[PDB]
Write a protein that binds this ligand. Structure first.
Ligand code: NPO
Ligand code: NPO
Ligand code: NPO
Ligand code: 6NA
Ligand code: 6NA
Length: 309
């Protein structure tokens, strides 16, 4: 009987009523479409912004599509947020997380560049990481196509995107971009392997992200358990940038985020650890279906402003 907010519980009851196929039982196109449909009906609508612009940058496999969000048509040099969507490195795209990106841009009053990285199974590990790193370095170089100079970058992302956040920050720590990572915001990230964790057993079914979906994602992505680009808990934390780790109390991978924040404290790094009570994985993208999660996102925003000083 873990604590669940009433609005969260109602959403979980509707998902249970829907029932229907697992990700693995669908075709890939169907699986991706169902995620579009879920966030389409569950999230608050897009904020209006001065700038919402599609562009691209070079990557190791070809061009990487990007989307720029900015509440300001013109702005001075400052930190730029570099966002990586979740979806197990298999599903999700620029549209599944579009509304959340507009919200981050609106509430932070900073530019946001979302990365349309290559997906598994067609592009297995480390394709997503390669693209997220390359796009983040490109933004950090203040290209003229972007139209706003970066004094630093802020990697942020949910779930798989929170995994990518941590990996990108480690890769740029080892080999700096043109400006530093000034803050990283992994939201319900995968840092340590969730297999064997207490949270995975406790929340394996009925809490939006399922153990079955995790296994489907594992099989598609094929990240080696010994590779720190797959499981960044294995990385060097001694120079980790300022960090905000946000988890959900009902998340099967909650303990992975607990592990990562503990590792940062162990290494003497500054970290804000926020564990949202009574909500699930995906809370950043279900802000209309579960209205209390808007407040959870706003707490992350407040922590970001504080850590940026
Ligand atoms: O990856 N996820 O966050 C998911 C995946 C499938 C789903 O039905 C809900 C959430
Ligand atoms: O999409 N996810 O959050 C995942 C995917 C795979 C995994 O092993 C753990 C978490
Ligand atoms: O979604 N993820 O973050 C993942 C997915 C697969 C994996 O092996 C490791 C992490
Ligand atoms: C929009 C998601 C596609 C990114 C490139 C890929 O399919 O692998
Ligand atoms: C093991 C999952 C139940 C959550 C109990 C805790 O907060 O540690």
């Amino acid at each position: 009987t873990p604590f669940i907010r009433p609005d969260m519980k109602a959403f979980l009851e509707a998902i249970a009523a829907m029932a229907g196929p697992t990700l693995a039982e669908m075709t890939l196109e169907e699986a991706r479409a169902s995620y579009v449909a879920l966030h389409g009906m569950a999230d608050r609508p897009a904020r209006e912004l001065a700038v919402i612009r599609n562009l691209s940058c070079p990557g190791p496999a070809g061009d990487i599509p990007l989307r720029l969000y900015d509440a300001r048509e013109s702005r001075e040099a400052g930190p730029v947020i570099t966002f990586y969507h979740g979806g197990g490195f298999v599903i999700g795209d620029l549209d599944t997380h579009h509304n959340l990106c507009t919200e981050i841009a609106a509430l932070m009053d900073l530019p946001v560049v979302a990365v349309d990285y290559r997906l598994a199974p067609e592009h297995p590990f480390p394709a997503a990481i390669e693209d997220c790193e390359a796009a983040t370095r490109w933004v950090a170089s203040s290209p003229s196509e972007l139209g706003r100079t970066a004094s630093g970058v802020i990697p942020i992302g949910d779930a798989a995107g929170g995994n990518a956040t941590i990996v990108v920050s480690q890769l740029l720590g080892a080999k700096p971009a043109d400006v530093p990572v000034v803050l990283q915001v992994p939201i319900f990230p995968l840092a340590s392997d969730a297999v064997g964790s207490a949270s995975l057993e406790a929340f394996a079914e009925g809490f939006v992200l399922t153990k079955a979906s995790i296994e489907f994602f594992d099989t598609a992505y094929k990240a080696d358990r010994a590779d720190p680009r797959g499981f960044p808990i294995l990385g060097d934390h001694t120079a980790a940038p300022p960090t905000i780790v946000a988890t959900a109390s009902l998340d099967p991978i909650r303990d992975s985020g607990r592990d990562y924040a503990k590792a940062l404290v162990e290494a003497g790094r500054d970290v804000v650890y926020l564990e949202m009570e009574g909500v699930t994985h995906s809370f950043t993208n279900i802000r209309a279906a579960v209205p209390s999660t808007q407040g959870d996102l706003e707490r992350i925003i407040a922590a970001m402003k504080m850590m940026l000083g």
